[PDB]
Design a protein around this ligand. Sequence first.
Ligand code: HEM
Ligand code: BR
Ligand code: BR
Ligand code: CL
Ligand code: CL
Ligand code: CL
Ligand code: CL
Ligand code: NA
Length: 397
Amino acid sequence: STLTYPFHDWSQELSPRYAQLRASDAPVCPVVSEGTGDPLWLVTRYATAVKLLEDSRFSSEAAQASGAPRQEPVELRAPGTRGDAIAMLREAGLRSVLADGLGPRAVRRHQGWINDLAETLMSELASREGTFDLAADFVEPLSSALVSRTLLGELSADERDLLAHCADTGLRFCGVTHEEQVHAFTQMHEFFLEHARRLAGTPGEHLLKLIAEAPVDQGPLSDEALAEAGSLLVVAGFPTSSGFLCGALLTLLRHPDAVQELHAHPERVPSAVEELLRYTPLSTGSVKRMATEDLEIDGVRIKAGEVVMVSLEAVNHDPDAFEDPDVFRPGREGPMHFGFGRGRHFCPGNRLARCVIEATVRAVARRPGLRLAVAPEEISWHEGLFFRRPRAIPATW
Ligand code: HEM
Ligand SMILES: [Br-]
Ligand SMILES: [Br-]
Ligand SMILES: [Cl-]
Ligand SMILES: [Cl-]
Ligand SMILES: [Cl-]
Ligand SMILES: [Cl-]
Ligand code: NA
């Protein structure tokens, strides 16, 4: 194939290429990685994505082994490490602890201060005269608090900035040198080699503490393994939450009549949270799986070792699954969205994510009149990030 991937759609306007692919006859389409030249397959239709992501012979772990074709310009790991940290934790027998640190018990522990913080932040903005920046003044402190209090432990401001910077530098398709990307993973790993044990020991019930204290049959977790967990929690939790919350705010500010309904009918907020997860695009790339044997999906042969990608954004905008997919329609009763993926790799951060998204939507819904202070086309976007994010969101009442 000569069609290079990704499609350079760094703003909320999805590349028209996704619709062209969806409308093609084949359910799986060949592309080539811009960053590596590797051949890849790409799925954009909901019905095919379901079959792929629910078939465990298309392996997520195997899409990382050395030699695997990939979309990313560099491997998403510090050199010399395993980089399969979620598998390593599950292998060590910690699914129990992961459920306790990320599941409904964690939401019950944290939802109180998350909603308090969202309201405090929004209230401070409501008290200002003039304009403010919802990215710097709302999303950054809320997402930083989520990561510190629920995942990593008490971070200094400088530590928070280092991790934010490593995530933004390493999780990119372009904009920096390959060497700079690899070094961002190395810097993050070296940080947690030195400090993860200390962070696991700070006050709170954050996940890194729960992992460090848990019983493991093969003897407690080592320094390298705790450091691998740290890097995982940054890459999985920080740029996703910050990018999504920024994008969701832009969606809410562009749909005032939706917000006025939520203001009038607070019980409708959960439905709007689910529609944001469908409608708001986050990743500029795709989830990936490697065929572990010769496989055939909807009639296309995939050879052992080939990698198949699913664009969650394309699937969430598939008109065969959603009527009027490019309309923001809370309470549309269609199928489940793909914002958190599908099947056995469904985002385990989904409970905490929904908590922070719900808190954000309610903070907005309680205060009608919030609007962009510039036109949407004047919003400036970070170009090349895996997780789309605006540079600023100028806003006002
Ligand atoms: C902020 C909004 C978030 C969104 C939209 C999001 C989205 C996703 C998606 C789509 C996947 C599936 C990847 C795949 O199929 O290969 C995923 C996986 C994952 N997410 Fe999230 N995520 C978010 C936040 C978080 C948070 C806060 C955490 C941790 C606290 C987290 C931890 C993980 C982990 C560990 C995985 C890998 C699971 C596996 O491969 O089995 N995510 N996330
Ligand atoms: Br846009
Ligand atoms: Br629908
Ligand atoms: Cl899990
Ligand atoms: Cl879990
Ligand atoms: Cl509970
Ligand atoms: Cl007030
Ligand atoms: Na380079």
